Design a protein around this ligand. Structure first.
Ligand SMILES: Nc1ncnc2c1ncn2[C@@H]1O[C@H](CO)[C@@H](O)[C@H]1O
Ligand SMILES: Nc1ncnc2c1ncn2[C@@H]1O[C@H](CO)[C@@H](O)[C@H]1O
Ligand SMILES: [Ca+2]
Ligand SMILES: [Ca+2]
Ligand SMILES: [Cl-]
Ligand SMILES: [Cl-]
Ligand SMILES: [Zn+2]
Ligand SMILES: [Zn+2]
Lengths: 524, 524
């Protein structure tokens, strides 16, 4: 039998540097994980041990940290080139800066093929982008050939900014004729590599005849066999074996997100390209694997521009930005409003999945806000100013909560009001009124939440049994500040973008901000 | 004596096409005024009649209409070249797209000198922008030479986006050594051409010794001798003669704004370059002057790209945008909120003077909002969609009003509530509560307005004798919809940017909008 090792990443989301275990900034330098330098170490070791190896990425390298804000994809081409990826599928985030932001930094500089069979170009763009991404690629591997076909979420127009000259076709209908072309070319080992989410990956394994293995992304799905090595709870075994409509066992794999795991799948094929066994598990890239010094030296070199960005003017304020603890731990503060508005706006512009692309409610612990920003002089705000406001190195995560849970979180927000501690919440898309003369646990007297999805979009009373989607710091999603009910009762929690980056890009895009105290939080 | 005719424009604000008498879109094609084609006719006629003629622009050609949104300054270089301007001073709006947006479209393409003596470049920019604008230029005119020195408002960093590598120095201190250089060169006829406002222009005429004539802008100042030909009321005679500290009569001139007038000043000089007389008046460019057909043919040709922009996707909405009359003439509607938020945000980003750069209150007649925009499909908003919402061809103007005036405007808003007419106001930066059970004229029971300039920026009760600055349609500033108290009582009214353009660029910059009904207007 001929054995192929597939190494794969997906939804790296600009985590070029090593991170903490939850994908936020690495605070404890000896428990960090992921990053491209550590990835390279582990990939090089397997390439030395195994004769036939492919390294694939299933999309969403773009977006998430200062690396993408400053380098805009040039860092993705440079470091994926340095790692010698064999192919990549386009994900939705690859369109976040429009087709122009995809063609220049990435499609023109990458030294490997970039694939998607279901994106059709038209008008003027068609001979402009022509051949810059491919529906399939035949790759030699050792003494054999493997074909790779790409696909990208049809939800891309609602998530990103691909423009009106690209059509996203149904994946299975677009994939079948390309796999048929590979079969006509006598390629008998075919990987479908793409970015549509685990549900669609399972449907492709079942329905696209000729596909031997599916390597996917988009849904941040973690699969693992046996006792998992970190906090992620697996959605199924790895590989997740799906039997096809033509009765073959098709391994389906994904490797969570954020470059925290390297997916590692070994497949044995018979002489006719049928899979006769498959086994593996994602490898946790934790600090027991050293960062490769030649990649890390390049990371250090590229970081100099990022460190320089710290003093650059992002925008201006026309108001004093009151991030003092005497304000933000006690009442509505306009710095809290600004940060919640940024959290919302960034996720609406750049959402990771449709499930989250209408989120319009935000809570933020006031103890998370650590400095004011004065408008004298000229009102200039820089990254360095924001880093003093948000110094903890966190992310702004997405959670789905029952109303009863959120009501308990607002009771917790004032249960010991007056003690100057950090759990008092600033909000966006929420109007709350407290009556502090009432018993702890019964101080919320009105709690109305923005409803975006409906007749006349508006604030409506929170309902205990309805479910709501909220953006908030990772620190609160994990139950910090005593918000144990959030951690214990939430229905879904996805990690999101790095925090200072999110606020800096919001100010960059607004240019002039004027947040004000406007009645989001009242006391009666 | 040697006689020089100075023709001059300032604060054209992207009004390349002819306009209505108030600078908004030309609706009645036979009462239109201004535009570059008509300007060219009148300038060519004077060039044929007079031997020594200079055509100067004192700044703020950038910004104001779709022409600048689509062409970003290339239209300014092209048409000022076609008119054969002899020189231009930089104004604040020339920095609205940053130094990069100034260097490429304008400084590199202009065929005339672009001047400013008080802008100093440093760091990397210094040898990059070097020589692309000049502190002075010596120009031959007929058989003599005239020197021109430029200057630009020190308020530019607070109005625009010139970056932190440009320093704006005090104008009189920067101008004096450059005028001294011209004197050393034996130039004895010196025009100071610049963009700092009439107050500063008068101080330059008094204090910069050697300046013969000041040609200014920025403050949209209209000067005229005798009975004025249109609606503008003159601030003084034209020219406005200032005696200098060295006892010379220095004509100071400006020509309003929007290309509506061509300034026309004749100066006689003795052999030593002393002004021995000066006379003139701005010429109203009204429809008695034909549009020049060679310039208009080019305007038509360049318009094709603008007409094409009408179908281009600007951004997306995630909410139904309710611009129906049943909503917007009766209660808060999220289309009204969106348009007021756009009006505010655009003017904060791109304000014409410091006087207006903190405006954070907006009123908008609900009868001005003429269509909803559905989110199906994909939520795409185009210029054409917005043109259906805002079809009247107006501008969003700046007014300063006493509180008592604004309170009367809110009483007018509901004085015959229920009759479905268009005077009901949508708002931004204002919370109003009405009690419709009370007498007409006494229905406003709460009226709180955002105060940006203060301790903890916030909504505070309107005070009858305080003065407030508000952005609103030209149609309301001129007393439309029965708001005669606004027209009759306002303290200052400046025309602003064209309306669909303002909303389109706001959506372009926000990318995804989600306006909602949030309690700006309540009934008790
Ligand atoms: N990782 C973190 N992210 C956000 N806020 C934090 C974090 N750690 C501590 N805080 C805030 O700092 C306060 C203590 O100064 C806490 O009550 C909490 O509100
Ligand atoms: N030039 C204009 N600008 C804005 N709104 C207008 C204009 N002309 C008419 N309207 C609105 O149209 C309504 C009549 O349909 C008027 O009551 C007024 O609210
Ligand atoms: Ca096969
Ligand atoms: Ca002189
Ligand atoms: Cl999925
Ligand atoms: Cl002035
Ligand atoms: Zn994705
Ligand atoms: Zn100006």
């Amino acid at each position: 039998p001929w054995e192929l090792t597939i190494l794969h990443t997906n939804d790296v989301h600009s985590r070029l540097e090593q991170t903490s275990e939850d994908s936020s900034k690495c605070v404890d330098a000896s428990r960090c994980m992921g990053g491209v330098a550590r990835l390279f170490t582990k990939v090089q070791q397997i390439r030395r041990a195994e004769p036939n190896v492919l390294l694939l990425d299933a999309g969403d390298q773009y977006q998430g940290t200062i690396w993408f804000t400053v380098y805009k994809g040039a860092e993705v081409a440079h470091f994926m080139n340095a790692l010698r990826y064999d192919a990549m599928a386009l994900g939705n985030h690859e369109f976040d800066n429009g087709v122009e932001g995809l063609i220049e930094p990435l499609l023109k500089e990458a030294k490997f093929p970039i694939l998607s069979a279901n994106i059709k170009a038209k008008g003027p763009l068609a001979s402009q982008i022509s051949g810059l991404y491919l529906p399939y690629k035949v790759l030699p591997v050792g003494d054999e050939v493997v074909g790779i076909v790409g696909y990208t979420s049809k939800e891309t127009p609602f998530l990103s900014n691909p423009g009106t000259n690209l059509v996203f076709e149904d994946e299975i209908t677009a994939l079948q004729p390309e796999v048929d072309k590979l079969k006509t070319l006598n390629v008998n080992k075919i990987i479908a590599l793409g970015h549509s989410g685990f549900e669609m990956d399972k449907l492709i394994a079942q329905k696209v005849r000729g596909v031997d293995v599916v390597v996917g992304g988009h849904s941040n799905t973690f699969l693992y066999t046996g006792n998992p090595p970190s906090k992620e709870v697996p959605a199924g075994k790895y590989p997740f074996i799906v039997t096809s409509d033509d009765g073959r066992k098709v391994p389906v794999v994904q490797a969570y997100a954020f470059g925290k795991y390297l997916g590692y799948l070994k497949i044995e094929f018979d002489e006719r390209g049928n899979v006769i066994s498959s086994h593996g598990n994602p490898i946790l890239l934790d600090s027991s694997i050293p960062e490769d010094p030649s990649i890390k030296a390049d990371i250090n070199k590229w970081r100099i521009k990022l460190d320089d960005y710290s003093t650059q003017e992002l925008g201006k304020t026309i108001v004093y930005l009151d991030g003092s603890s005497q304000s933000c731990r006690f009442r509505e503060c306009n710095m809290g409003n600004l940060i919640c508005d940024a959290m919302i706006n960034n996720n609406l512009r750049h959402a990771d999945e449709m499930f989250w692309n209408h989120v319009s409610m935000c809570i933020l612990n006031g103890g998370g806000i650590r400095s004011p920003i004065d408008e004298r002089n000229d009102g200039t705000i820089t990254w360095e100013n924001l880093a003093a406001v948000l110094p903890f190195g966190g992310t702004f995560d997405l959670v789905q909560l029952k109303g009863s849970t959120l009501k308990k979180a607002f009771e917790h927000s004032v249960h010991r009001y007056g003690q100057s501690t950090g759990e008092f919440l600033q909000v966006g898309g929420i109007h709350v009124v407290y009556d502090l003369s009432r018993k702890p646990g019964d101080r919320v007297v009105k709690l109305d939440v923005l409803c975006t999805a409906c007749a006349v979009p508006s604030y409506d009373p929170l309902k205990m049994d309805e479910v709501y989607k909220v953006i908030l710091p990772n620190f609160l999603a994990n139950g910090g500040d005593g918000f144990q009910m959030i951690k214990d009762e939430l229905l879904r929690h996805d990690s999101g973008d790095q925090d200072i980056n999110v606020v800096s890009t919001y100010i960059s895009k607004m240019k002039v901000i004027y947040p004000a105290v406007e009645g989001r939080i009242k006391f009666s």
